[PDB]
């Protein structure tokens, strides 16, 4: 699990990430002074209850996160990102870069992935906040690895998502048309004939707290 | 030091003044002794400055925590719980405070909690050096009908007269007015310095 | 115990799920202000104590679970939940959403699908209770993968229960049409002229504590 | 504090006062001093109010998941046992209480529990500063033979008799009463109030 | 050790049952107001001192064992039963209800099968006694899974015993009557002609302690 | 000891003495109380000299190490938090230090910070055994609209009071002015020399 | 993982070194009084923000380190490196000998190639800056190896890079000129008709903190 | 004991007596307070014997240890920030402790250390129950531009006077002196008694 | 890695042998008062500091070191060795028997053959220096097995150098001979028509500390 192969590779990270594969499509996207985040709820049975155990967490105030792959180990990294963001918080007053927060994350992922007797995670989070350098967006995936974005995905139609941003992705665009961009893009993803129900959606602007749209909000983008 | 807490019908009301001293030597003219700790949920200090300070920091993190996980606010009651097992865990090692939480859940609710994490609810309360003084105002002024306006301007009062008998009190009179329909809203300083001189008061 | 496979599954995990669907089947249903649980059990020998029978067990006066699949794991699980919602209760003075309690009992079964040196435990647990949000209903399968409810089943006749209720199951029912609804969707899973005997009832209400349906109120419904 | 817990032929009836101090410092007028901590078992506390409060969450936990892994209620003197462990572990570091345990098991009981977990079942007892005060009320006027009504008066004239001669006694009394047919029941104010007038007493 | 088959099976500890079938057969049963337990000495050369390593044991005044499987083992659980029942005692002063200290037992058995670097016990028990409920026979396997019964039996005439008792056994027998259905149906376990040389009894009635019979008062019996 | 710090417009300004005693012995004449502890901050000791130079170190130690992580400098009020945690949780075996902690983030700041963790934000503040005489000048004489210039002559002259009164206080006075525009900057000695003989002063 | 193969080497190590060489190519050398970093920059797409995740990593305001391998391993290694460097300014006042910085982080690295239990990192590190001794240039590779050198190089390009510098290196280079000829040494490495993107470039001189070239500063370059 | 260190342009100058007292009763007239702990370092001790010669041991070990290492000697104010460090570390459980270190790297250092990890650098420095005798002679009589036969003459005289007036101090004077050209060179006694002889001096 | 093969050997300590034979060369000879340390030296790269990571090592200034293999964990054995005698001259105030030094390290080596979860360590080790007996020479090897020499080689050239001092050696000669019949000796193990370049060379002499030959004055005896 903690094993080079002759080529130098980690299979047991490679095949964690084939998990996060499995998992329903979300992306975030930096815009005008804020960012969002989109996620694709594939949601079954009328018998669930549709209105809890959400794809999009907030971390605090100003940091939410998506994961995508193992549903039980993305539940308890999310737990550990809220406590350690809190950590930051009593030790200096306040979280001055976000990036510190996804690094303490992908720490304990890197560890899982180096040490005996211990699988690694089988998730990738995006976390998209605002802290004293502006609207962050980054990702995590089961190795550790972290990049910081303007646009990303993560989830079975990751690929998809990505091709479609990086053709018509610009910078800057105010909140709806950048929601739009975003619903748009996951549209993309999808097999033709199957439609796009209710993605949660949840936007930040500087100088403010996250909202997360009500179902009603949504709706006037599909 | 000098801090209340009242409920009325829907409100909670909580004041402090500022004074922060060492001995006789008044260091700080302007200290902060009245914190927001949740969405309707405030919190006032009294005793050593370092420990009640790391108590404001620990609430406002926890709270925010224990929203994000429960989805709702914690009532009141169970800060004043939570504090209660902190403080009692610590009670030969203590943290040497008097609280005051106050907020509104379902209803209004003031609480205050001593150094073994004695929690006491009541319909007010006060702490620090000038409560006694505090005391004898509400006792004789306080009513459970008063309007938001006329319970400002009794803690108002009630403040006044501890700094004019307490000498580890003094500074800018501090107020906080929290509701259901406004949330947790602090009193602009002029507003304060208004009711002041409309009362027939100083500093 | 705690290795991915190539395609990312951890087939441990599947295996103890595989131990869950061997065991007697259990449900749960919302209804108007109120949420109820059924249960069956094959007794055998007509030398058993019946009333010792350890099923729908209370983890507090207004909270309750069933378990299927390793009868010893889940009674383990059932005394950590009881004792964690003691500890939640005496730090806050009350318990405020069950459904925090059902994340402790599914963060301890997803470290046994993480650490080696340990087995997942082969159970599944539905939690049923009232908490501030109001009539909760949830699951909780091996790999600590936890969902809310309007209705579910556990055990080898969930299939044909989930089935039943898919098709018949309505919100806001009456306890008394709800109980009813119930025993129909467990008399559906059942062999062919397979008679169902009494199984144990649970319910509860907003304002009230559980009830357990006694021997002889149960039998109206039959 | 007073507190007092009677047992009769089939019942147990635990009363208290509401008086809540800082040395002289009266804080709190209506603190609350007797618990209900399973179906049929109630508790007083006296003494430091971090602790006894830390101690009747305890024990209202406990006591209900022993009930729940059991199936029976914890019996009165099993109850009474937990305790004296618990408190003499302790002993060097302790709870600084008094507590009385009162219920219905198979009959009715009433144990004090000291801070080093000394435990002692009584016909009657009583603890807090106005204890004495009650103890020359019982030991005048207690009949085994006293129904519940008169058993009810008889706790309100002890704890009135202490609240006249204790200072650190006061505010409300409280009064429940515990049988088999009816478990535990609190008497309400209008009921205690209205006794007090019937007898000829006061707070 | 602590591994799910495909089939969610855990064959050490199905294994652990084979050791167990192999152990000579004991019984207990309820009758008015009392319960008892018999078991098959099955001893062998005059050279052992016989009436010295008793199969019933006492685990308090109050409350007997009789176990079967590897006897080592057995030993080491029975030790666990006896001070396990002390610290209850101590604790709360009385043991209300035996069912939790069989939990305890049972808990013990269970971790066992659970955790990597142990293997199951090879013992199956019955308790028997009186609690503040009423009489009590339960038994626990090697998996620590439990059973309250009317009458029941372990060992390797079980099946017999179990299939006689099930024709033979009525409710509220006087003792003697009692113990007479159970050599009854403990000779029924035996090959044909084999006989049945001394078994020890031990019965306890609603306000009494225990007693074990003496080798002269079973000989009535046979 | 005497040390200083004061807020203007755009600037802080720092500022001690020198002197190191044992009891009444002037060991040292020279010794240095005032640092730079990050680009844009700078701290001022008083009490036990080892608990001191030890705080100075760990200070410069994770400054710089947050700022490598964070890509940005520690907000004054997060470096007043640390060191208000850090001697808080050994309140019981304490650093026995005063601390003043100044300079710009988006803002000037001087706070605080005593041997138990408490801090408080100031426009100026004072530590040592020369600080009450400090307090003196600094309540007659400053002034919100100083310039630079007038700050530093108020600070030599307020410290030029503290070491004639205060036989704990003496040596050559140090400071150090902090800017957006020019960062952390200690005055060379001749310039402080030069406004001595200008002010018409000593030492 | 901590084994020798009969002719005594260590192929968990040498694998560890496989991992390194798919890692994007830099390289240090020294100049006159001076010496500098360069790191090329496999950028994904525009939707990566560039501010970020850089390949050079300042250990204090005098030490500077790039790494090559596994990304999350190597920020675990330059996390280490900064704190180790902050404990020893706090021991002693001052940084005396870089040289026991690199051992530290080196030691750290063997350690991981000794005990069971952990694989070996996947990183090579230079280390580069100013001490009492002067200018200063390392490497460090998964085995805990180090060597100082006079320029080097690591990441895929290595080789190229390395017979580039070993025709065409000079010591005592003013800064531009030894920039100019880092920038010549990269492009060798680069596959024909691939474009330099444009790397990132750090240098320090005695006397002096480093600086990090911004972008239209390496523009003049390349 | 006496002890000083001085510094000149280019040399540093340490010496001792050696008497060792238990109160009024001299145990040894001839211990050694004066050792060379690195190439271009020397230290010495007053206080508790058996701390300051564990505290010696470490040193030579650690500077030793650190050169080979490092491939350079310690700096003189790192001998002195690890010495701090050391003392700190265990400061409510001291080396009872007056340490003086002294060398050359760059430049000629004098340190002197506390039992608390206080570390001053200084021109020149003392300890020991003989150090104010030592200090008036300095005040008066020190200059920064003598010559290094004329700086031994002081040490001499200083440490003479001491002898004279604190009966804890006593013995042979033993000087070093530390310079690049020759290293730490421990002056031979015949020389000394010389210097003695040639000053007018005792004992 | 701590186990006994049927002959009785130790493979892995053998295996960590063959790494110590590939290590350069390295000698050590005593003479009249004194003894000498020699070391071949492999350049290799006019880009690498022919300056530091030298081959002899200063334990303390009477005691000097050389090894051979793992180029880390003889570093790592060294800091050990440089530690601990450190600690012996804390203790006893002086290191009086060179022997028990190297014991203390050959013991640290013998431990890491018996205990399971390490691997030993791939390196040879000659110590040399003066103490109360004389000047001494020892060597130790991966096993932890030591032995006092007259002279002694190790690395690749060991059989060489051994079989010409074997023929050559001579007692009690003057430092340059000494170093003369060792340099030859050096000369001798290598391959027909490759040169020796600067090898180090240390030597001490009874009331002195050692000395390190400079680059000048070994070049005088090539």
Known sequence: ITVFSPDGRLFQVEYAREAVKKGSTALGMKFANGVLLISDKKVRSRLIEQNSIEKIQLIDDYVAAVTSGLVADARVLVDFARISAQQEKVTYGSLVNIENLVKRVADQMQQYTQYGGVRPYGVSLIFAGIDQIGPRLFDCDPAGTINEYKATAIGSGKDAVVSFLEREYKENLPEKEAVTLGIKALKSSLEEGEELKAPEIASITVGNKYRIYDQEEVKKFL | ?203
Chains 1, 3, 5, 7, 9 share one sequence.
């Open chain 2, 1 to 203: 030091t000098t801090t209340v807490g009242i409920t009325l019908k829907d409100a909670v009301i909580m004041a402090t003044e500022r004074r922060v001293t060492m001995e006789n030597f008044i260091m700080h003219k302007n200290g902060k002794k009245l914190f927001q700790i949740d969405t309707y949920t405030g919190m006032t200090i009294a005793g050593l400055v370092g420990d009640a300070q790391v108590l404001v920091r620990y609430m406002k993190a926890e709270l925010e925590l224990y929203r994000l996980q429960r989805r709702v606010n914690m009532p009141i009651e169970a800060v004043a719980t939570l504090l209660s097992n902190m403080l009692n865990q610590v009670k030969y090692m203590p943290y040497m405070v008097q609280l005051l939480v106050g907020g509104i859940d379902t209803a209004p609710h003031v609480f205050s909690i001593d150094a073994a994490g004695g929690s006491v609810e009541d319909i007010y309360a006060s702490t620090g050096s000038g409560s006694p003084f505090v005391y004898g105002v509400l006792e004789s002024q306080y009513s459970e009908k008063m309007t938001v306006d006329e319970g400002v301007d009794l803690v108002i009062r009630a403040i006044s007269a501890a700094k004019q008998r307490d000498s580890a009190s003094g500074g800018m009179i501090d107020v906080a007015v929290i509701t259901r329909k406004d949330g947790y809203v602090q009193l602009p300083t002029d507003q304060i310095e208004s009711r002041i001189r409309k009362l027939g008061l100083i500093l």
